[PDB]
Design a protein around this ligand. Structure first.
Ligand SMILES: CC(=O)c1ccn(S(=O)(=O)c2ccccc2)c1
Lengths: 216, 215
């Protein structure tokens, strides 16, 4: 994980407000007035937009404001404009391990209607199992905005290793698709009660589960 | 407001060294030892590789070394590996709570090894078939460089409708992955002897075939 917790994505339409949060502990976010926020347009240098929870550097419009309540800092962007479409990171001093960062929130300025993802979960194919592979694929299509977070479970347990998710890409219908794949051994696949794919889009999570069958 | 100065690009072959510079002013880079370097893979959070000019955080290999002379910080990456191919940003605090960032250097690791796609074709899931859907997925992973073409067959005949292929994306092994998905009805899927996914990469084609289940 990242050391501070940010929600992976947030969205608004032009001229609306968005608040994104940054959660730590009493020793980092809640121990001082040291929260910073940074804005990054993809493939461009990031920029500091807030320091000391609330302070705007020269040239940052007052549409951006920062606040904090105990262990959670918040950035509010009022009057969303096209240029506000970017990734936002927070940071806190932690005293003991110096500077701690969140994992970034992708903020989308809605360019089209919101669309919830179609999630399909494929158990291992016969051919790959005869090749000693039990890779599962979680197909995620037809969503907007193009920001999705994928988690896998082995039974109820988070599974960390063997997960890859493709960078969502705009398809012919102008909505996004991605696939997540989990590279299991046939042993792992057959020996568990189930595997699940959990897909989070626009602050809402969808889950699909598959289990081994006698046949294919 | 002003960026720190980085060259837009640099490069090295595997095992070689690259050195990249970050030029500020006497009031930022030249004014204290608060220079940081970050590594960023496109579409991912950055990783801190150096803080306070020279210091590697936990888990950053000793291949990454940071120095400063006057107003210019330098990062040297030695024994270059595919994973080092990335954008590198420098930062420096100045006066008045200012934080300055470089424009970023894209470091290319030259001559990365060609890799043929692993192709896995999945017939419709039980769940989607119960929901009156028969989408097939052709998973395409572990290929390099990141350009593939995908054609589908229904029995031996070209499929001209219903195909989406995602734009290849670099995964954590530094090789490309994509999925092709064919949106069939349960009727289309069951009315054919098989469906085939043909993946073309660097003039070479891999074909996989699936058929309605007998279970
Ligand atoms: C984990 C870590 O150290 C992080 C996370 C965000 N940032 S940054 O906002 O200074 C940034 C630096 C370089 C490129 C993009 C953003 C640093």
């Amino acid at each position: 994980q990242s050391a501070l917790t940010q929600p992976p994505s947030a969205s608004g339409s032009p001229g609306q407000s968005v608040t994104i949060s940054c959660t730590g502990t009493s020793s980092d976010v809640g121990g001082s007035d040291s929260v910073s926020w940074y804005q990054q347009h993809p493939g461009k240098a990031p920029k500091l937009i807030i320091y000391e929870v609330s302070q705007r550097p020269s040239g940052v419009p007052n549409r951006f404001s920062g606040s904090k309540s105990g262990n959670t800092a918040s950035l509010t962007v009022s009057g969303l404009q096209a240029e506000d479409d970017a990734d936002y990171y927070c940071s806190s001093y932690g005293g003991d391990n110096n500077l701690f960062f969140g994992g970034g929130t992708k903020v989308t300025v809605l360019g089209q209607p919101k669309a919830a993802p179609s999630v399909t979960l494929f158990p291992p194919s016969s051919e790959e199992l005869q090749a000693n592979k039990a890779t599962l694929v979680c197909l995620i299509s037809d969503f907007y905005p193009g920001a999705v977070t994928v988690a896998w479970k082995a039974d109820s347990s988070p599974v960390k290793a063997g997960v890859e998710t493709t960078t969502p890409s705009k398809q012919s219908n102008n909505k996004y698709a991605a696939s997540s794949y989990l590279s299991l051994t046939p042993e792992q696949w057959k020996s568990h009660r189930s595997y699940s794919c959990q897909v989070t889009h626009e602050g809402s999570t969808v889950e699909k589960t598959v289990a081994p069958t006698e046949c294919s």
